[PDB]
Amino acid sequence: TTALVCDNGSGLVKAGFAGDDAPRAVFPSIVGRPRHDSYVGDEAQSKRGILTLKYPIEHGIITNWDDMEKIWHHTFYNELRVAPEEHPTLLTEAPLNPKANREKMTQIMFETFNVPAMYVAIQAVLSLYASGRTTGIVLDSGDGVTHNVPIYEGYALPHAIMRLDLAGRDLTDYLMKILTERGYSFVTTAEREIVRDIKEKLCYVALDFENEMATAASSSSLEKSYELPDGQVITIGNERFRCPETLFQPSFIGMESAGIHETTYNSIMKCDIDIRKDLYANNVMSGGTTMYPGIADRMQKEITALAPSTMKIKIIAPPERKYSVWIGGSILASLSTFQQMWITKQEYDEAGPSIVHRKCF
Amino acid sequence: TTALVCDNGSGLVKAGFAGDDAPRAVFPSIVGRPRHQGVMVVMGQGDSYVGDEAQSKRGILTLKYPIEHGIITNWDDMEKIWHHTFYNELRVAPEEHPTLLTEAPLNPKANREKMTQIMFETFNVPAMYVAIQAVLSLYASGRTTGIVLDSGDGVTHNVPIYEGYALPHAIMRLDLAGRDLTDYLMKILTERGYSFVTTAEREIVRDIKEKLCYVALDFENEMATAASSSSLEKSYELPDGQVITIGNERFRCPETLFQPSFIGMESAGIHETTYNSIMKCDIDIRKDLYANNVMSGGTTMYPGIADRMQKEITALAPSTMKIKIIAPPERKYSVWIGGSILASLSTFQQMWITKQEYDEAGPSIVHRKCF
Ligand SMILES: Nc1ncnc2c1ncn2[C@@H]1O[C@H](COP(=O)(O)OP(=O)(O)OP(=O)(O)O)[C@@H](O)[C@H]1O
Ligand SMILES: Nc1ncnc2c1ncn2[C@@H]1O[C@H](COP(=O)(O)OP(=O)(O)OP(=O)(O)O)[C@@H](O)[C@H]1O
Ligand SMILES: C/C1=C/C(=O)O[C@@H]2C[C@@H](CC[C@H](C)/C=C\C=C\CC1)O[C@@](O)([C@@H]1CSC(=O)N1)C2
Ligand SMILES: C/C1=C/C(=O)O[C@@H]2C[C@@H](CC[C@H](C)/C=C\C=C\CC1)O[C@@](O)([C@@H]1CSC(=O)N1)C2
Ligand SMILES: [Ca+2]
Ligand SMILES: [Ca+2]
Ligand SMILES: [Ca+2]
Ligand SMILES: [Ca+2]
Ligand SMILES: [Cl-]
Ligand SMILES: [Cl-]
Ligand SMILES: [Cl-]
């Protein structure tokens, strides 16, 4: 009688029962095995010394099915302590998940997990119903990828979704490399995890990258100190923003592509002139990486400089945009009319994978 | 490239091209099969006739309707109809156009499947979609929430739709429609000393029905005026050349939509069922339902029937509530129009159930629509 909501992402797996204000279980989307029968989640973490951690979900898409099965096995039985052949499951996916991909996912749930019924929703679309809209422009910047999904009354326009392969994780590797030069150690997978913390605690986006990269020399009351688990301390400079900035200047990491602000545009324009007014009016921030302070107003500015002088622009960055996707998953699956949207195990048996394709949401 | 919108009804088939304000083709849903001939010899099988082709030689051929009360009971004859609809009426190649098919509220899934299976197998349509008549009659009136009244020739469904979705449990199906009303006006005419009984005579009473008949507000306030004055009718010149006049009978006929007692039935009246529906719904929305009532169907074409409802229900529902009766002038084809609109829209491209899909999934796929 109680459905499940499992938002598996390149970095974190967000699980929980529908109708709950937040994901109950939240663990790393990793899977370890003897460095040469297989550990997973927060457990695998504590055995890094003798393991070889692999993220199954790569850039939002599933690339290692054998390990995903284990993540889901662990997600049901260990993390949630529940019976899969007893609960309707809602799984999220990434914009443009290749048909084949999704077809597989559906099969595994039935064939190998016996889900009574299930459904697959688009991460992006969900964050939107979580913000409270059916039409808009979503920005999903997490660990794996960063997408911009434009949605007209519930339907995301595939012809205009932009995929920026830089995100949260990538930002850490950069935060690292800019701390080796300002004199400091850091370089192993284990250490990588501490950068991720500084990156999550200090770093912030700035309005004027230059009127802030100048204050660097002058004052100094713009930075702070970080007490690492080693007891040793560190002082951080311009890095506090020369890091998230990348999101806007994918040059510091080489990359190539346009900044998140630009693509957010380069997408809106790939849409039909009619909806545009609403798409600029409803810009939704979603995903962990969209947490750096100032990223809100920064975007705000940076794009109104692309947009027509005659057009309202509203950036929406909800406080819980960290678990945004999950929430909408929860909400949606608790909705009355969704009931008839699930895909029964029976319907599966007769029709097969494919059926999981036409949805509506 | 251009979608086909075919509305299959108990008595008439409305088929046309998307984007048109009216169905190009409208023929009767029947098939003629030269009397008896249920033995060997006289070989050749005599073949069958469909549509207008039929009638015009009916004398020596028995007619059967494939759609009974809105549901398809004879696939064989139906196929034929569809064939005729594409090649002989619309004059097109079913393999080149996507088709939108209408169904009756609560159409048996088995059917929908058979229906979808036949369209893809015996016709090779590039893609199709099945819509619920009522819903379309609603989309065409310009709403996504309200209660629709579909009184056609073989059925009078009463469907409550909210935001584009029909509410199953809250649907009333009244096995009483136009065809019935005809048989009746035909009975009370031999009560005023007359004839008419051959299937060919039925067709004229139907003409007499659609021409004079009307629905008076208060029944026993007009019936009186019947015995009093006489300025309540007129006369009609049939082929016979002769002439007939019908007092009382003009309204005493459609009054069955309200007083099913008149022919037995024993089912509450259309005005009643309409209530019993709004009731079975969720109290939170009954408000939005009473203001969005929609008349749709050939039988909803009587003059005055509009206001007879305005009255007949206000009397049954909470005084504290504005009621609205929306009876568009086209309700005669409304079902189609809605579908025509539908088929001709961007957001719909997704909705079509392409063959490629049917090819890998089968009938079972024509169930996930959400409109
Ligand atoms: N408060 C914060 N400030 C900045 N970055 C944060 C914060 N909290 C989490 N993050 C970052 O956002 C990234 C994570 O997001 P999310 O939880 O959005 O990823 P997923 O959903 O796990 O992955 P994907 O987005 O690739 O599908 C993390 O890798 C982390 O570096
Ligand atoms: N102007 C009119 N006045 C009265 N009755 C009419 C009028 N026009 C049509 N009808 C009656 O309504 C019936 C037709 O409706 P419709 O076109 O509603 O039927 P269908 O769609 O053919 O059948 P069904 O809806 O029962 O499945 C006709 O067969 C006729 O008896
Ligand atoms: C609180 C937390 C959050 C999180 O998002 O973890 C994800 C998952 C994690 C898996 C690998 C590590 C060793 C194992 C366990 C980590 C546990 C908890 C870490 O790899 C990330 O760290 C990467 C690396 S660098 C970055 O930017 N993302 C993001
Ligand atoms: C103008 C017209 C309208 C119509 O709706 O016809 C439909 C179809 C028709 C088919 C049978 C007849 C003999 C053959 C051809 C008729 C052609 C046109 C008839 O049988 C109905 O008449 C019956 C009889 S009485 C009634 O209520 N339905 C409804
Ligand atoms: Ca995510
Ligand atoms: Ca947890
Ligand atoms: Ca779409
Ligand atoms: Ca009809
Ligand atoms: Cl990596
Ligand atoms: Cl708001
Ligand atoms: Cl009959």
| CATH code for the domain of B8 | 3.30.420.40
- Cβ neighbour number for residue A59 with a 10 Å cutoff: 16
Determine whether the interchain pair B365/A358 forms a contact, defined as Cβ–Cβ distance below 8 Å: yes
Could you give the number of structural domains in chain B? 4
> Which of A219, A253, A287 represents a domain boundary (last residue)?
A253
Tokens of B226: 């019947």
Give the atom of ligand 4 at the shortest distance from the alpha carbon of B180: 27
- Looking at the CA of B10, name the nearest ligand: 2
Between A152, A341, A354, which is nearest B361 by CB?
A354
Residues framing ligand 3 (Cβ under 6 A): A 11-12, 28, 30, 45, 143, 168-169, 172, 189, 192-193, 196
Report how far ligand 10's centroid is from the alpha carbon of B7 (Å): 43
Q: Write down how long chain A is.
A: 361
Residue B83 Cα to ligand 4 middle (Å): 20
- What atom of ligand 3 comes closest to residue A199's alpha carbon? 27
The whole-angstrom distance between A316's CA and the closest CA on chain B is 26
Token look-up 């690492």 returns A228
Tell me, what CATH number does B237's domain have? 3.90.640.10
Q: Are residues A194 and A215 in the same domain?
A: yes
Q: How far apart are alpha carbons A280 and B201 in whole angstroms?
A: 66
Across the interface, do A354 and B360 touch by the CB < 8 Å criterion? yes
User: How far is ligand 2, taken at its centre, from the CA of residue B332, in Å?
Assistant: 7
**Ligand whose nearest atom lies closest to the CA of A149:** 7
- Is A360 within the bounds of a domain? no
Give the burial class of B236: count Cβ atoms within 10 A of its Cβ; 0-12 exposed, 13-18 middle, 19 or more buried.
Answer: middle
The boundaries of the domain holding residue A89 are 2-30+57-120+323-355
B295: left (phi > 0), else alpha (psi -120 to 50), else beta? Answer: beta
Are the beta carbons of B265 and B298 closer than 8 angstroms?
no
Residue with the smallest CA separation from ligand 1 atom 9 is A288
Is B12 in the same domain as B93? yes
Residue A163 forms beta bridges with which residues? A147
Does ligand 2 have an atom closer than 6 angstroms to the CB of B15?
Answer: no
Give the C-alpha distances (Å, rounded to integers) separating A140 from A160, A292, A354, B154. 15, 14, 27, 54
How far off is chain B from A153, nearest CA to CA, in Å? Answer: 10
Q: Find the Cα–Cα–Cα–Cα dihedral B39, B45, B50, B53, rounded to 10°.
A: -110
One domain for residues A149 and A264? yes
Q: Which two tokens stand for residue B332?
A: 């005669």
- Statement to judge: residues A139 and A190 lie in one domain: no
Largest Cα span, chain B:
72
CA distance A343 to chain B (A): 9
Given a contact cutoff of 8 angstroms between Cβ atoms, the answer to whether A52 and A137 are in contact is: no
Interface contact flag, B368 A355, Cβ < 8 Å: yes
CB B128 within 8 A of CB B326: no
* B210 CB within 6 A, ligand 2: yes
Whether B361 sits inside 8 A of A355 (CB atoms) is: yes
Pocket test for ligand 2, best of B210, B296, B308 (most atoms within 8 A of CB): B210
B164 in the same domain as B296 = yes
Any residues with CB less than 8 A from the CB of A66 and at least 6 apart, and which? none
Give the nearest ligand 2 atom to B299 CA: 12
What is the three-class DSSP state of B252? helix
Chain A residues with a Cβ under 8 Å from any Cβ in chain B: 152-153, 155, 337, 341, 347, 350-352, 354-355, 357-360
CA B205 to ligand 4: nearest atom: 25
Same domain, A276 and A160: yes
Q: Between chains, do B364 and A357 touch, taking CB under 8 Å as contact?
A: no
Ligand 8 center–CA B216 separation, angstroms: 24
What Å resolution does this PDB entry report?
3.5
Instruction: Determine the distance in angstroms separating the CA of A63 from the nearest CA of chain B, rounded to an integer.
Output: 25
Containing H/E element for B132?
strand B127-132
Angle at B165 between CA A348 and CA A275, to 5 degrees: 95
CB of A169 closer than 6 angstroms to any ligand 1 atom: yes
Cβ atoms of B152 and B270 within 8 Å: the answer is no
Residues from chain B that touch A359, judged by Cβ atoms under 8 A, are 368
| Domain-embedded: residue A76 | yes
Residue A10 CA, ligand 5 centroid: distance in Å: 7
- B365: DSSP letter: G
| Residue A142 tokens, joined | 């997490």
Cα(A256) to centroid(ligand 5), Å: 23
CA distance A354 to chain B (A): 7
With the C-alpha atoms ordered B281, B285, B286, B289, is the resulting torsion angle positive or negative?
negative
Task: Give the span between the Cα atoms of A148 and A158, in whole angstroms.
Answer: 11
Residues B38 and B160 in one domain: no
Tokens 């007359």 identify what position? Answer: B194
Q: Are residues B151 and B85 in the same domain?
A: no
Query: Chain B: nearest CA to A89, how far in angstroms?
Result: 18
Residue of A nearest to B363 (CA): A351
- Do both A155 and A271 map to the same domain? yes
The Cα–Cα gap between A94 and A328 comes to 15
Residue of A nearest to B162 (CA): A337
**Under an 8 Å CB criterion, which residues of B touch A?**
165, 347, 350, 353, 357, 360-362, 364-365, 367-368, 370
Spatial distance between the Cα atoms of B127 and B3, rounded to a whole number of angstroms: 9
Which ligand is in closest contact with the Cα of B346?
7
- Kindly state whether residues A25 and A101 are assigned to the same domain: yes
DSSP strand pairing (A31-32 vs A25-28): unpaired
- One-letter-per-residue 3-state SS of chain A: CCCEEEEECCCEEEECECCCCCCCEEEECCEECECCCCEECHHHHCCHHHECCECCEECCEECCHHHHHHHHHHHHHHHHCCCHHHCCEEEEECCCCCHHHHHHHHHHHHHHCCCCEEEEEEHHHHHHHHHCCCCEEEEEECCCCEEEEEEECCEECHHHCEEECCCHHHHHHHHHHHHHCCCCCCCCHHHHHHHHHHHHHCCCCCCCCCCCCCCCCCCCCCCCEEECCCCCEEECCCHHHHCHHHHCCCCCCCCCCCCHHHHHHHHHCCCCHHHHHHHHHCEEEECHHHHCCCHHHHHHHHHHCCCCCCCCCCEECCCCCCCHHHHHHHHHHHCCHHHHHCEEHHHHHHHCHHHHCCCCC
Query: What three-state secondary structure class fits B270?
Result: helix
Instruction: Using CB atoms within 10 Å of the CB of residue B148, give its burial: 0 to 12 exposed, 13 to 18 middle, 19+ buried.
Output: buried
Domain boundary among A231, A253, A275: A253
CA angle A18, A151, A133 (to 5 degrees): 55
Q: Give Cβ neighbours of residue A336 (< 8 Å, ≥ 6 apart).
A: none
How many angstroms separate the alpha carbon of residue B5 from the centre of ligand 10? 41
A175 and A91 inside one domain: no
Question: Is A361 a domain residue?
Answer: no
Do B262 and B304 lie in one domain? The reply is no
Q: Which residues of B touch A341 (CB under 8 A)?
A: 370
Beta strands at A39-40 and B146-151: parallel, antiparallel or unpaired? unpaired
Q: Which atom of ligand 2 is nearest to the CA of B13?
A: 22
State the CB neighbour count (10 A cutoff) for residue A100.
Answer: 9
**Interatomic CA distance for residues B94 and B119, integer angstroms:** 9
What is the Cα–Cα distance from A253 to A173, expressed in whole angstroms? 9
